[PDB]
Amino acid sequence: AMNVPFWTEEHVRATLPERDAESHKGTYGTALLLAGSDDMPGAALLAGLGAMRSGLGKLVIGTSENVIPLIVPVLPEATYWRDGWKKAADAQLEETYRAIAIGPGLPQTESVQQAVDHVLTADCPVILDAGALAKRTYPKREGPVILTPHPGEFFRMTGVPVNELQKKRAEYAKEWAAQLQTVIVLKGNQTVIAFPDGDCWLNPTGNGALAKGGTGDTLTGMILGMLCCHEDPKHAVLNAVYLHGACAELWTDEHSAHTLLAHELSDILPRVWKRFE
Amino acid sequence: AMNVPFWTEEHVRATLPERDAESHKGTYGTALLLAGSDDMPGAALLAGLGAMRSGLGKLVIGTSENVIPLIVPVLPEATYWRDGWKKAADAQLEETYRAIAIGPGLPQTESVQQAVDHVLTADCPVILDAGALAKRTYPKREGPVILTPHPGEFFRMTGVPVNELQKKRAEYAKEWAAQLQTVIVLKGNQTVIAFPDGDCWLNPTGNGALAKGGTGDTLTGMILGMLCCHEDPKHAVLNAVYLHGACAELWTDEHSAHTLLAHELSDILPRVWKRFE
Amino acid sequence: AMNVPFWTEEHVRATLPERDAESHKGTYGTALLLAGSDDMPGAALLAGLGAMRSGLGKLVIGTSENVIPLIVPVLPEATYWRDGWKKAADAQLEETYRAIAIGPGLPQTESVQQAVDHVLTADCPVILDAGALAKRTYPKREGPVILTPHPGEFFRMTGVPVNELQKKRAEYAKEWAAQLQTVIVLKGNQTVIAFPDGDCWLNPTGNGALAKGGTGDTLTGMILGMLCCHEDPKHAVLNAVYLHGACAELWTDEHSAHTLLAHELSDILPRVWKRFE
Amino acid sequence: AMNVPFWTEEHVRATLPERDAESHKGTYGTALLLAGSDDMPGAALLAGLGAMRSGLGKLVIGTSENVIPLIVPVLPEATYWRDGWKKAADAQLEETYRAIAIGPGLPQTESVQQAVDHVLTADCPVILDAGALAKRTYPKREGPVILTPHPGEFFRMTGVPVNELQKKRAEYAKEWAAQLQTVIVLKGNQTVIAFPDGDCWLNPTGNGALAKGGTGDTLTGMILGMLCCHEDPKHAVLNAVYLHGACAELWTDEHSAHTLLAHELSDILPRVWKRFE
Numbered sequence A, B, C, D: 001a002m003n004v005p006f007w008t009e010e011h012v013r014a015t016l017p018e019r020d021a022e023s024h025k026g027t028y029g030t031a032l033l034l035a036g037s038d039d040m041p042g043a044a045l046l047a048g049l050g051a052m053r054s055g056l057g058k059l060v061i062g063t064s065e066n067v068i069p070l071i072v073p074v075l076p077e078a079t080y081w082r083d084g085w086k087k088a089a090d091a092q093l094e095e096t097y098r099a100i101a102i103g104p105g106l107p108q109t110e111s112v113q114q115a116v117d118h119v120l121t122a123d124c125p126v127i128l129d130a131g132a133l134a135k136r137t138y139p140k141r142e143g144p145v146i147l148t149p150h151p152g153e154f155f156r157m158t159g160v161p162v163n164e165l166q167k168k169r170a171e172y173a174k175e176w177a178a179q180l181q182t183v184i185v186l187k188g189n190q191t192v193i194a195f196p197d198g199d200c201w202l203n204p205t206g207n208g209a210l211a212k213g214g215t216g217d218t219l220t221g222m223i224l225g226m227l228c229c230h231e232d233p234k235h236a237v238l239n240a241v242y243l244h245g246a247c248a249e250l251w252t253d254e255h256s257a258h259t260l261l262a263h264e265l266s267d268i269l270p271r272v273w274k275r276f277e
C-alpha cells in the first residue's frame, strides 16, 4: 500500500453529530435527490430511504413523474419535484438546498450532464453517482463535488482499466481526486475515500453482502443525508461509507451474506447508528 | 416563562378513554381527513395512519384521485371521498363527521380556504394544518377550531417573525389563541397548547428525532383520531401531542435520533399507548 | 338469554383441520372473492389477506381492474378475475370453486344482487357480506349461504331496528336464519352464529379493538379460507369468528385496543392459530 | 421406491458457496427473470424476491410494463427489461446473463414458446416453469435446462396422468429427464430432482404450508439466484429446493401450516441459510 489510514470507529464516534432538543428540521436542511427514471425506478427509492434515514431535515426527490407513485407508499415523508432531474437540464436551481445528489437510476446521457452542470452552480456539496459519472472536468465552485464510482465507473471516468485499477486502488483514487479536484469514493472492499486536498482514508467496514444491486444507491442517499447533519462534509462522507458497511456486518451476524437486500441497510441503520453515539 | 404547566403523564393517564367490550365502531365516530395532493401526496398517508391508529371508528380520506392508490396498500382500512378536498371548496358537507382535519399536503390557496369555510359550518371539532393555515379570522361556531402551526406557519398567520416568536412562545400562542378564538398547537420543543378560553399547557415529550419532514402530518392524524374517542376535545389534543412525543422517546432508546421516519411514530403508538392505560 | 352456548376453545381445538405432509394445494381448494370497487378498494385487500391466511389452496380475486394493482404488492400470492364482480352480474360462473365470498367493498346495487344470484347457482358454500346484503330471499341450493351482517345491515335485511335487535340478538338472529334458510353471523360483542337448522352459538372472543373499519372485511376473508380447509362448513364459520376475535385479544396484551388496524389481524393469525393446534 | 437418496443437510453444508470479502457483484452474475403478465402479476414479484434473496449479483426482470410498478416498492433492487418476455419472442437475447428463468405468471401460449426457443440459444442455465412448460423437445445446447413442473404440469408435458404419476414419481421423473435431456424438479412432498445424466435425489424438507399458491414461483426465483452463486448448477438446484422447504419448516415451529404466504419464504431464507453456513 501507500499506508492509507482506516477511518475507524474512534473517528466515527468523535465526529457524528448530535440532534439536540432545541433543533428544528431547518437546522438539518433540505436535500435534493435527482434520481430514478422510468427505466430504472428503484434507485430513487433506495437513495431516498438512505437519505431520510441519515439525519436530513427535509427531502425533495426530483424523479420522473411515473416513479413518484412507487416511492410514496414506502417513504411518505419525501416530497417531490416532478420530473426534476429533467427540468434541471434546462435551468438553474432556484431553491437553496443543503446538499444535492444526482445520478442513481439515471441514464448516461448528455441531458444528465446538463443537469450536473446546473447542479454545480449551487453553493452546496453535490454528489454525482451512476449515470451522472462521465469522463469530464469540474468547475471551480463553492462546495465539494463528491464522485462515488464503482471500479467500472472509474474506468469510464478515467480510462484506467478495472484490472489495473484494482492493483493500486488508492494510488489511482488519490491521483484522480487531485486531478479532478473532486472527492472520490472508489467503491469495493476497502472503499477508498480520496479528497482533493490529498487527504485519503480506507473504509474498514462491510462485506460481500454488499456485492448486489442497489447497495450503492442506498449509499448515495446516506451520504446525502449525512451532508445535511454534519458541519464538516468530509466527516459526512466518511461516516456514511463507514456506517453503510457496518449495517452489512450487523446483517451477517444472524443472516447469510448471500441474502441481503439493499433497502434493509436503511432499516438496520437506526440501531447501528445508536451504537456509535 | 409565564409558568405554563406541563401536560404530564398523570394527566394523560387520568384522561385517556376506555374502549369497552360493549362498543361498536359508531361509538368512536367517522373522521374526515382532507389532505394530500398530487404534488404532496405523502402527507395524506402519514395523517391517515396517525388517525386510524388513534381510536376512531371509521376514516374517510378526501384526497386527490391520484393519491388514493398510494394509500390503499398501506392503510386498506381507510375509505375515500374522491377529490374531496377540492369538492369541499364548492359545497357544504352533507355527511356528519365526528371530527374533520384539513390541510396536510394541500397548497396554500384560496380554494383550500374555501374548503375551510365549508368545513367550519359543520358542528364538530375541526383541525387546520399546513396549507389550510393562513392569515384570517374564524366564524363563531359549534365545535373547537384547532390550528397546528410550525413557527413559520405562525408567522404566516400573524406576522410575528419566527426569531421573535421563539423568545416568548407561550405568550404569543396564548395571545393569538385568544384573539382568533382557536386552539393553537404551536409546534417545536416544548410544544404549546393554547386554548381560546385561556387555558394553556406545554408538552413535555419528544425530542430532535421529530425534527424531520412528515412528523407533523402524523400528529394531525393523531389529533383527528383522538378527537373521535375522547369526549373532551381538549384532552384529545393534549393526549395526542403528548403521545406523539412519547413515541419519539421510545424510538431513541435503541435507535439514533437522526434516523426516525414519521410513519414509524404510528407503528410505535400501539405499544406506547398501552403503557399509559 | 336463550342459553345459547359459546363456541369454546375446546370446540375449536377439536375441529381445526390438519395440513398433512401428503397434501397439495388442490386439497385445499380454490376460493373466489368478489370484492373491492374503485370507490371502496381496501376491502378487497383486507378480505384477500384474511382468505389466503386461512388455509385455502388458491385465491382468485374478482375485483375492479383499478383495484388489482393495489393488492399485488401486499398479496402477490393472489390471482385475478379482472372486473369479476361485474362480470358475475352477467353470466354463470364457468369455473368450480371450493367457496365463494361476495360483497366487501361493493356497492348496494341491483347489479351486485344479479352477481349474487349467479354466485348462488354454484354448488359450494357462499358468503354474502356488506354490499351484497339486502332485503331478499334465497333459492334452495346445494351449499350453505352465509350472511355476515353488522346490526345496521341486519336492519337493512329485516326491518328490525338496531335498538330493538340489540336487546334480543340471538333471538332475532335465530328467527331470521330460520326464515331465510341462511347462516347468520350477527356481528358485535358476543357475535351470534345462527344456523338454518336451528343450531346457534355465541362467540366468546374479541374486544373493542375490533370496533373499527375493516375488521369485518378481514373476517369475511377468514371465513372464506376456512371454508376451504374444513370439511364441515359449520365448523369453518365458527372457527373463523373465534380465531378472528382471538387475534384482537392477543393484540391487546401489549398494544392499546384503540390502535389496532384490521390487516394486522391477518398478520397475528399465524401465531394464534398455532396455539390451538 | 428405487432407493433414490435424499439431498441431506450434510450435502447442503458441503456445497453452499462463500461470499468472500474480495467479491464484487459481477462475481455473482446478472440473472434474467421472464415472468409476470397483466393477468398474473404476482408471480413476478414472488420469483423476483426469491432470486434477489438467493445470492445473485444483479436481477433484470422482463415483465409486462404494467407489472413493473407493482414490483418496485417491494423489490427496489431489481432492474427491468420492459415487456421483456414478449420481446424475447421476437429476437435473440443480445445481453449475456449468468442464468435465465422463464414462465411464472406467463400464459401457456405459442409466443411464450417462441421466447423459450430464443432463451435456449443463450449459453447459460435456463429454468422453465409454469406457462413455459409444454409438451415439446429441447435443442442440444450449452447449459442445463431445468424444468420445474407440479404434477399437473408434468401431465401436460408427458401425458402421464397425475394419479399414475403419483404412484411412481421418481421413476417417471427419471425417465422423462433422460428422454428430454433436461433437469426435472417434480414438485410435491418429497420433491424429485432428476438429472439428465441419470443422477436423482429426493428433497427431505418442507411441509403442507407450501401447498398454496405462489410457493413455486418463489422456488423458481430461488433456483435462479442459486444458479448465479454456485459454480455447480446441480448443487444450485438441489440447495434451492432444500432451503425452500427448510423455510417452511422454520415457519411451522411457531406458526400454523395453514397460514404461510409464499413471499414470507423469502423473508425467512436469510436466517435459515445462515444456519447451514
Ligand SMILES: Nc1ncnc2c1ncn2[C@@H]1O[C@H](COP(=O)(O)OP(=O)(O)OP(=O)(O)OP(=O)(O)OC[C@H]2O[C@@H](n3cnc4c(N)ncnc43)[C@H](O)[C@@H]2O)[C@@H](O)[C@H]1O
Pocket (backbone or CB within 6 Å): A130, A149, A150, A151, A152, A153, A155, A162, A186, A187, A188, A189, A190, A191, A205, A206, A207, A208, A209, A210, A211, A212, A213, A214, A215, A216, A217, A218, A219, D020, D021, D022, D023, D024, D025, D026, D058
Ligand atoms: N468491468 C466492469 N465491471 C463491472 N461494471 C462495469 C465494468 N465496466 C463498466 N461497468 C459499469 O459500471 C457500472 C457498475 O454498476 P452496477 O454494478 O451495474 O451497479 P448496480 O447493480 O446498479 O448497483 P449499485 O449502483 O447500487 O451498487 P454500487 O456498485 O454503486 O455499490 C456497491 C456497494 O457495495 C460495496 N461492496 C461491494 N462489494 C463489497 C465487498 N466485497 N466488501 C465490502 N463492500 C462491498 C461497495 O463498496 C459499494 O458501497 C455499470 O454502469 C457498468 O456497466
Ligand SMILES: Nc1ncnc2c1ncn2[C@@H]1O[C@H](COP(=O)(O)OP(=O)(O)OP(=O)(O)OP(=O)(O)OC[C@H]2O[C@@H](n3cnc4c(N)ncnc43)[C@H](O)[C@@H]2O)[C@@H](O)[C@H]1O
Pocket (backbone or CB within 6 Å): A020, A021, A022, A023, A024, A025, A026, A058, B130, B149, B150, B151, B152, B153, B155, B162, B186, B187, B188, B189, B190, B191, B205, B206, B207, B208, B209, B210, B211, B212, B213, B214, B215, B216, B217, B218, B219
Ligand atoms: N422561518 C421559517 N422556518 C421554517 N419554515 C418556515 C419559515 N417561514 C415560513 N416557513 C414555512 O412554514 C412551513 C414549515 O413546514 P415544513 O418545515 O416545510 O414542514 P414539513 O417538512 O412539511 O413537515 P411536517 O409539516 O410534517 O412537520 P411539522 O413542522 O408540522 O411538525 C414537526 C413536529 O415535530 C416536532 N418537533 C420538531 N422538532 C422537535 C424537537 N426538537 N423536540 C420535540 N419535538 C420536535 C414538532 O413539535 C411537531 O410535532 C412551510 O410552509 C414554510 O415554508
Ligand SMILES: Nc1ncnc2c1ncn2[C@@H]1O[C@H](COP(=O)(O)OP(=O)(O)OP(=O)(O)OP(=O)(O)OC[C@H]2O[C@@H](n3cnc4c(N)ncnc43)[C@H](O)[C@@H]2O)[C@@H](O)[C@H]1O
Pocket (backbone or CB within 6 Å): B020, B021, B022, B023, B024, B025, B026, B058, C130, C149, C150, C151, C152, C153, C155, C162, C186, C187, C188, C189, C190, C191, C205, C206, C207, C208, C209, C210, C211, C212, C213, C214, C215, C216, C217, C218, C219
Ligand atoms: N344504525 C346503524 N349503525 C351503524 N351502521 C348502520 C346503521 N344502519 C345502517 N348501517 C349501516 O350498516 C353498515 C355498517 O358497516 P360499517 O360500520 O360502515 O362497516 P365498515 O367500516 O365498512 O367496516 P367492516 O365492514 O370491515 O366491519 P364490520 O362491521 O363488518 O365488522 C366488525 C367486526 O368487529 C367485531 N366487533 C366490533 N366491535 C366489537 C366488540 N366490541 N367486541 C368484539 N368484537 C367486536 C364484529 O363482531 C365484527 O367481527 C353500513 O352500510 C351502514 O350504513
Ligand SMILES: Nc1ncnc2c1ncn2[C@@H]1O[C@H](COP(=O)(O)OP(=O)(O)OP(=O)(O)OP(=O)(O)OC[C@H]2O[C@@H](n3cnc4c(N)ncnc43)[C@H](O)[C@@H]2O)[C@@H](O)[C@H]1O
Pocket (backbone or CB within 6 Å): C020, C021, C022, C023, C024, C025, C026, C058, D130, D149, D150, D151, D152, D153, D155, D162, D186, D187, D188, D189, D190, D191, D205, D206, D207, D208, D209, D210, D211, D212, D213, D214, D215, D216, D217, D218, D219
Ligand atoms: N390434475 C391437476 N391437479 C392440479 N393442477 C393441474 C392438474 N392438471 C393440470 N393442472 C395444472 O397444473 C398447474 C398447477 O399449478 P397451480 O396449482 O395452479 O400453481 P399456482 O397456484 O400458480 O402456485 P405455484 O405455481 O406458485 O406453486 P407450485 O405448484 O409450482 O409449487 C408448489 C411448491 O410447494 C411444494 N409443496 C406443495 N405441497 C407440499 C407438501 N405437502 N410438502 C412439501 N412441499 C410441498 C412443492 O414441492 C413446490 O415447491 C396449473 O396450470 C394447472 O391447471
Ligand SMILES: [Cl-]
Pocket (backbone or CB within 6 Å): A023, A024, A025, A026, B150, B210, B211, B212
Ligand atoms: Cl421542525
Ligand SMILES: [Cl-]
Pocket (backbone or CB within 6 Å): B023, B024, B025, B026, C150, C210, C211, C212
Ligand atoms: Cl362495529
Ligand SMILES: [Cl-]
Pocket (backbone or CB within 6 Å): C023, C024, C025, C026, D150, D210, D211, D212
Ligand atoms: Cl401444490
Ligand SMILES: [Cl-]
Pocket (backbone or CB within 6 Å): A150, A210, A211, A212, D023, D024, D025, D026
Ligand atoms: Cl459491487
Ligand SMILES: [Mg+2]
Pocket (backbone or CB within 6 Å): A129, A130, A150, A216, A217
Ligand atoms: Mg452504483
Ligand SMILES: [Mg+2]
Pocket (backbone or CB within 6 Å): B129, B130, B150, B216, B217
Ligand atoms: Mg406541518
Ligand SMILES: [Mg+2]
Pocket (backbone or CB within 6 Å): C129, C130, C150, C216, C217
Ligand atoms: Mg362489514
Ligand SMILES: [Mg+2]
Pocket (backbone or CB within 6 Å): D129, D130, D150, D216, D217
Ligand atoms: Mg408452479
